[PDB]
Amino acid sequence: NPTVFFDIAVDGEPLGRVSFELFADKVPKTAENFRALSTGEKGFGYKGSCFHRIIPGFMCQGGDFTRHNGTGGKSIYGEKFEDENFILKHTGPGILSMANAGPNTNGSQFFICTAKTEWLDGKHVVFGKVKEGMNIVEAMERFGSRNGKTSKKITIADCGQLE
Amino acid sequence: SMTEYKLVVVGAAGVGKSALTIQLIQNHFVDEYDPTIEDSYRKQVVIDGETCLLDILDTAGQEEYSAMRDQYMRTGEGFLCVFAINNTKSFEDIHHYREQIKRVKDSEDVPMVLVGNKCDLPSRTVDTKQAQDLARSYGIPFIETSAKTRQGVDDAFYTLVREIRKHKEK
Ligand SMILES: CCn1c(-c2cc(N3CCN(C4CC4)CC3)cnc2[C@H](C)OC)c2c3cc(ccc31)-c1csc(n1)C[C@H](NC(=O)[C@H]1[C@@H]3COC[C@@H]31)C(=O)N1CCC[C@H](N1)C(=O)OCC(C)(C)C2
Ligand SMILES: Nc1nc2c(ncn2[C@@H]2O[C@H](COP(=O)(O)OP(=O)(O)NP(=O)(O)O)[C@@H](O)[C@H]2O)c(=O)[nH]1
Ligand SMILES: [Mg+2]
């Protein structure tokens, strides 16, 4: 399974690096999308994009690098792609899973759980987890709110794949 | 000072609750889909020669969280019940939204307006008469709107204010 990282910034000041294991063993198409978006190798991807929705107690959501407003993003296969499988569940903090607007609408938006979110099982494709830096994701919750609007600009200042 | 009116916009996901609210508050039309978690807005308006303050709660249509609607239905004074004229399921959902409000309020007499949105679109599956007949059977107003063209936007929110005022002063 490949590993990728995000270097997170808060209003442009470094906060730290989060790394993620992508479950290519179980969800190869979804893992490869997130890997390639993290390296930017298709000419677009997560670098410079923000976490637009942070709700303490639940999750940090990001990945809209096309519109930067929570409505956009696109995959390496087209604007949307199908739900690959729902084998893996939202078992606890650190789970990395795809956001969507209903069935078969995966793009680039994703979320990182800060709690177990069992009611999303079967609805969102889980495809990775935080490896190092979970405390950075916890620290991002300091900037969230009840409806998810953030109080500082939380960005992926750099990202890529770890050897 | 001026009177504040607590309005709550409900209805199935995608019917245009947020597009209506943003048209009212900000005079622009959101073409993109930004499904709501929950948003609150304030606007002062002149209705029948008097200025008042609207406090508008724009709610999620997400069906998965239907059991968490009780708290906002308790505090809201009047409800805009929105469906889309090209989505028969969203019209069928109206009954269920209204019944939930009545249950939470424990009242058959709750200020409400039925709103048939997306009236600019040619795909109409719910007829005006069918919606008019339904509103008449509920004893509430019915207004067709388009958040895209602004047709009926002000009228739907102002009519709801008038329904709340009648109820407060009764
Ligand atoms: C009812 C209020 N409320 C809650 C919620 C619920 C609860 N519970 C639920 C569970 N109970 C336990 C069983 C006992 C406890 C009480 C408590 N408090 C709240 C909040 C804080 O009250 C304000 C939520 C929630 C979520 C939605 C709407 C309203 C919601 C909603 C709208 S759209 C969506 N969900 C999916 C969204 N889609 C898009 O963003 C599409 C955009 C367009 O196309 C690409 C892009 C998406 O993929 N994700 C990625 C996944 C997490 C998800 N967002 C999200 O944000 O969930 C927020 C939250 C808080 C987890 C759930
Ligand atoms: N043609 C047309 N499109 C509309 C109209 N109102 C909303 N839309 C479109 O329909 C989609 C859903 O609108 P939106 O306001 O987000 O609906 P909502 O009821 O708030 N959805 P949610 O419950 O998920 O928050 C968007 O693409 C929006 O542009 C309307 O009157 N006419
Ligand atoms: Mg909305």
Numbering used by the authors:
A (entry chain D): 3 to 165
B (entry chain A): 0 to 169
Tell me, in the authors' exact words, what the paper reports.
RAS family genes encode small GTPase proteins that regulate cell proliferation in response to growth factor stimuli. Here we describe RMC-7977, a reversible, tri-complex RAS inhibitor with broad-spectrum activity for the active state of both mutant and wild-type KRAS, NRAS and HRAS variants (a RAS(ON) multi-selective inhibitor). The binary CYPA–compound complex then binds to active RAS (with dissociation constant Kd2) to form a tri-complex structure in which CYPA sterically occludes RAS–effector interactions. Although neither RMC-7977 nor CYPA alone exhibited any measurable binding to GMPPNP–KRAS, RMC-7977 makes multiple π–π and hydrophobic contacts with RAS in the switch I (SWI) and SWII region once the tri-complex is formed.
Kd2 values for the most common oncogenic RAS variants were all within threefold of those for wild-type proteins. The ability of tri-complex formation to sterically disrupt effector binding for the various mutants was also measured, revealing a good correlation between the Kd2 measurements and the biochemical EC50 values for RAS–RAF disruption. Notably, we observed minor but consistent differences between the various KRAS mutants. pERK suppression by RMC-7977 typically appeared complete across cells expressing various KRAS(G12X) mutants, but consistently reached a plateau in wild-type KRAS, KRASG12A, KRASQ61H, KRASQ61R, KRASG13D and KRASA146T cells; by contrast and as expected, trametinib reduced pERK similarly in all cells, including the BRAFV600E MEFs. These differences indicate that KRAS genotype could affect the cellular response to direct RAS inhibition, and that the cellular response to RMC-7977 inhibition is not equivalent to that of MEK inhibition. Preclinically, RMC-7977 demonstrated potent activity against RAS-addicted tumours carrying various RAS genotypes, particularly against cancer models with KRAS codon 12 mutations (KRASG12X).
